[PDB]
Subunit: 186 residues, 3 copies
């Protein structure tokens, strides 16, 4: 039975079982990561024949976001519970994709309108939810020690979603629109 | 004319007409409930022939979320304005659905990736927005008396969305994926 | 290379290059506007033959939201960097659309369930994200001078999304549902 009712007065438990209010910065941080993970699942459900090449990596991101959320739910001071997420191989893996997707699509110097195909648009939504989760992770960092590797990966991840969004448009022959007042920023 | 312009400097009114800033915790709480309600409307628009059995209950949730938001917009101390939402029958109704949907789908012991079909994925998005609204309701509770029945229902509602999401996948013969590092948690 | 890694410890730059934490109210404000802009791109991707008349204006909103975000990223005190967004013509343009869409659809006196077609439902999601961004803009205003024209436009914009959502339902012969406990509020 998934409903325990223990949360009905607004408190809940983190890893190690201590109790926090649900609006605690820590709970908010891994809560936003869960929201992002759910949005990535929604984004993956929009994949079509033209965009199947993106499916595996989005599922892999979902697995990695669970690892990130686990670590955000882990208090530094309880030595019974270790951080598990190590940024190097995940983050390199993102960077390789950012480099290959940047190479393939038409180069721009301006910001672009976040949109195009339904999948590209969903990848821009993922980009911005990732950045919202990142803000909450930084909130938490300013009050508690965190696994800083999670922050590295989450920062890189929104660049991945930008590059993937442009690639998704490319895969369906949809051009990106430029912001009509962009200075040359890239 | 829906635009009054009275909010153009960032203030607005709650039930009873007092004026608050738009970033007041109370406004944020029922604002997040409105966002959830809109997402539930979007989720319902994704229903297909295979998933029609979910339509009625999602519309009912929308009506209940208006009742919740009304109460969150109601200050305790103004006796002219009563709380209207009573948790027992709504919450029991959710629990019956959680029990029947839990029964029908394949049992898991691990966390699952939030995704699958477009509708199941949208139900996971609903789950996480509900939880975001819940955090904001708890913020407000820690500063002002609230209708605690709203919090009970909102807590239960995210368990409903989890169970419904798994059921939606079942209705389209889509299995759930396990988190590859989940301990047995359920 | 879009990834600089300068943000990997949670700090970033605004217009004029000063450094802020990513959870700074200013960063959150224009971050929520970026999220809204991405959602408007997603909403536009749902346009069908029946709803093509809405495409141009949603793209125009995306361009205007970049102008708003630019100004939110601009500190008042650095005289090298000017506000660019002027509310009058954008806001009048929204109001004309609100008036024409209000005229055409069936009049209601009660709140409606936010939903209907997939596009109308997405326009209600846009409405509520706009309002979430507005709360964060008001947060920032209460700590720093801002371009108040941005707030005018963002307030009006959520009324636009409400009116457009009802119009989208009308364009596909979908009626709006009333909240079953609404007093006559409009
Ligand atoms: C303002 C701005 C934006 C704003 C634009 C929103 C708004 N205000 O309208 C927002 C937050 C949306 C934005 C987003 C992004 N931006 Co930008 N942005 C800037 C910024 C701060 C100023 C650019 C400028 O106008 N020139 C200065 C006058 C700079 C940093 C800076 N202070 O120069 C970056 C910067 C231009 N952006 C950058 C990037 C990478 C992005 C994103 C890809 C980040 C992301 N992963 O989401 C997106 C792209 C958005 C798009 N749709 O094209 C990088 C570009 C680096 C490069 N080598 O290409 C810069 C230089 C920041 C940095 N140093 O990391 N950005
Ligand atoms: C961490 C965790 C999560 C995190 C996982 C995110 C992350 N950190 O990666 C998040 C917030 C996503 C999560 C979500 C949920 N979780 Co969880 N979760 C936990 C937690 C705190 C630790 C589990 C663990 O690893 N073992 C301990 C080492 C426990 C509570 C606890 N302290 O034990 C619950 C707990 C395992 N989760 C629980 C539940 C119900 C859920 C959700 C269904 C809640 C919801 N309605 O959204 C979802 C399921 C998510 C999924 N996709 O399967 C329940 C299970 C109870 C039961 N009888 O089945 C527990 C026991 C919490 C509780 N007591 O209410 N959870
Ligand atoms: C509560 C309320 C809501 C709540 C309802 C949520 C909840 N609590 O359930 C929320 C935030 C969702 C809401 C949203 C909107 N509302 Co309303 N709402 C009110 C409010 C505060 C009380 C209405 C009431 O019950 N009568 C009083 C007992 C009034 C303001 C007030 N204090 O009277 C407005 C008010 C009724 N709402 C108004 C409007 C315009 C809206 C929105 C269109 C705003 C928007 N752009 O999103 C939406 C419509 C939502 C819908 N789906 O129909 C206006 C109507 C003005 C008019 N001439 O038509 C009012 C009068 C506020 C104002 N003065 O600007 N609202
Ligand atoms: N609103 C929320 N936002 C983010 N994380 C939450 C929220 N509520 C609970 N959590 C976290 O997610 C885990 C799973 O949530 P769950 O809803 O099962 O917990 P609960 O609300 O404390 O209990 P219950 O829902 O059974 O009364 C909790 O153990 C806690 O770590
Ligand atoms: N940004 C917002 N987030 C959440 N709730 C809001 C927000 N702005 C207003 N509210 C609430 O929702 C109701 C309807 O919003 P509405 O936009 O009509 O109000 P307003 O902004 O004060 O007025 P106007 O938009 O006509 O200038 C308000 O009466 C207030 O209770
Ligand atoms: N999480 C965020 N939320 C909102 N705005 C952000 C966030 N991170 C950065 N910004 C803003 O958006 C701009 C573009 O973001 P970008 O991710 O390129 O910056 P960064 O994180 O500081 O650098 P990098 O990602 O290259 O390490 C930044 O210059 C800053 O103004
Ligand atoms: K639960
Ligand atoms: K209004
Ligand atoms: K970057
Ligand atoms: Mg530890
Ligand atoms: Mg970054
Ligand atoms: Mg009262
Ligand atoms: Mg709960
Ligand atoms: Mg200036
Ligand atoms: Mg308003």
């Amino acid at each position: 039975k998934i409903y325990t009712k223990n949360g009905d007065k607004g408190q809940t438990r983190i890893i190690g079982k201590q109790i926090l209010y649900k609006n605690d910065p820590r709970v908010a941080a891994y809560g936003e990561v869960d929201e992002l993970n759910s949005w990535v699942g929604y984004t993956k459900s929009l994949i079509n024949s033209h965009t199947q090449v993106l499916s595996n990596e989005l599922e892999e991101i979902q697995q990695l976001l669970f690892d990130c959320g686990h670590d955000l739910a882990t208090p530094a001071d309880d030595e019974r519970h270790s951080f598990k997420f190590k940024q190097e191989q995940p983050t390199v893996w993102l960077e390789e994709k950012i480099d290959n997707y940047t190479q393939v699509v038409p180069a721009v110097k301006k910001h672009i309108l976040p949109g195009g195909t339904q999948l590209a648009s969903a990848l821009h939504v993922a980009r911005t939810i990732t950045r919202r989760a990142e803000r909450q992770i930084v909130q938490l960092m300013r009050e508690e020690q965190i696994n800083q590797d999670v922050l590295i990966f989450i920062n890189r991840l929104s660049d991945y979603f930008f590059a993937a969004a442009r690639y998704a448009n490319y895969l369906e022959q949809q051009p990106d629109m430029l912001y009509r007042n962009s200075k040359d920023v890239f």
